[PDB]
């Protein structure tokens, strides 16, 4: 079986904002690394572009 010796291997905490997590870590004395949230950028979708008269976006199959 898989054996461990550290008691915090399963500890995961949930927070509403980054600032809340930072405050909790600071008041508990833990040094932390923060990663900014990654949000997918808005994209421009066009179903008509599948059948362009002169562009490369025209699809060869459906």
């Amino acid at each position: 079986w898989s054996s461990t010796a550290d008691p915090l291997s399963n500890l995961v905490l949930t927070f509403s904002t980054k600032e809340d997590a930072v405050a909790f870590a600071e008041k508990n004395g833990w040094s932390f690394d923060v990663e900014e949230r990654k949000v997918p950028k808005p994209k421009s979708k066009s179903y008509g572009a599948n059948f362009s008269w002169n562009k490369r976006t025209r699809v060869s199959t459906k």
């Binding site: 008269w53 002169n54 060869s60 199959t61």
Partner: protein
């Protein structure tokens, strides 16, 4: 019901990429004329006719013919395979000299297309979807062929034979296997889509160019 024909190609001694196929020079001229009917930036539109031409030259479509069509038109082979498997008139397997197609949809079914199917089966001694040992005749069931007024009907090698009785189809088969060309169309003294007797419409002579043209024109 079930289609019965697979849509996966497995290489075979008589159907493989090295099977010989090539267009004739006359067919190449016809292909050139076909491609000249579409805008210069869209040559894939010629896939449907050219593929058909290959079959008209070969009788069926080996994978070599599809590869040749794809190479000629600069289209990827998978697109040609897609077209060849989507459309039911393409033969991805050899067929007899005469391809017999019997419409069995409801308008033709109401006028006893089953008798025509049974007469063909009895005359040729083969099941639907089977090809005779001689190989001249191949039989299949098709959907509505657009001649429901003249029912029951049959299509043999892009020829329409209409208003069929079992005797009519027996004579058609007899003169087809005797090397003769049967007369296409109805077989009831009708020869068109008019009523069988009387000609209830269009009896008065048609009128000339300027019969009822409006003023100021």
């Amino acid at each position: 019901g079930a289609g019965g024909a697979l849509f996966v190609h497995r290489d075979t001694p008589e159907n493989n990429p090295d099977t010989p196929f090539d267009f004739t020079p006359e067919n190449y001229k016809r292909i050139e004329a076909i491609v000249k009917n579409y805008p210069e930036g869209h040559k894939a539109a010629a896939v449907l006719p050219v593929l058909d031409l290959a079959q008209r030259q070969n009788g069926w479509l080996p994978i070599s013919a599809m590869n040749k069509v794809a190479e000629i038109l600069q289209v990827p082979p998978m697109r040609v395979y897609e077209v060849a498997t989507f459309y039911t008139m393409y033969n991805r397997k050899p067929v007899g000299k005469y391809h017999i197609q019997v419409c069995t949809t409801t308008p033709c079914m109401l006028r006893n297309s089953d008798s025509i199917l049974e007469a063909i089966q009895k005359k040729l001694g083969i099941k639907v979807g089977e090809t005779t040992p001689d190989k001249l005749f191949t039989l299949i069931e098709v959907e509505c062929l657009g001649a429901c007024v003249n029912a029951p009907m049959v299509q043999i090698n892009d020829n329409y034979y209409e208003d069929l009785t079992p005797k009519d189809i027996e004579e058609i088969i007899d003169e087809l296997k005797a090397g003769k060309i049967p007369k296409p169309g109805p077989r009831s003294g009708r020869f068109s889509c008019e009523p069988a007797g009387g000609l209830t419409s269009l009896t008065e002579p048609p009128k000339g160019p300027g019969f009822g043209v409006q003023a100021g024109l």
